[PDB]
């Protein structure tokens, strides 16, 4: 559901969904083309 998210200061608004992209263990963000934040991991429970 559309919801404000504040991931350790990473502030944004959007619909968060169960991710299906494979972040390698050294990756904590996700960028699409034109640098749009497409996926994020939780700094607390480590969920993509």
């Amino acid at each position: 559901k559309c919801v404000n998210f504040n991931f350790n200061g990473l502030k944004g608004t959007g619909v968060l969904t169960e991710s299906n992209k494979k972040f390698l263990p050294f990756q904590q963000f996700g960028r699409d083309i034109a640098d749009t934040t497409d996926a994020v991991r939780d700094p607390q429970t480590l969920e993509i």
């Binding site: 992209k21 972040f23 390698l24 050294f26 990756q27 904590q28 963000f29 996700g30 960028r31 699409d32 083309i33 996926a39």
Partner: peptide, 23 residues
């Protein structure tokens, strides 16, 4: 005592996933 590194040495520079997009 010298030899060339053909293309070795590159690495993932910044830990922000990108799929199928030339960075």
């Amino acid at each position: 005592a010298y030899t060339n590194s053909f293309t070795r040495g590159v690495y993932y520079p910044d830990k922000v996933f990108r799929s199928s997009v030339l960075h």
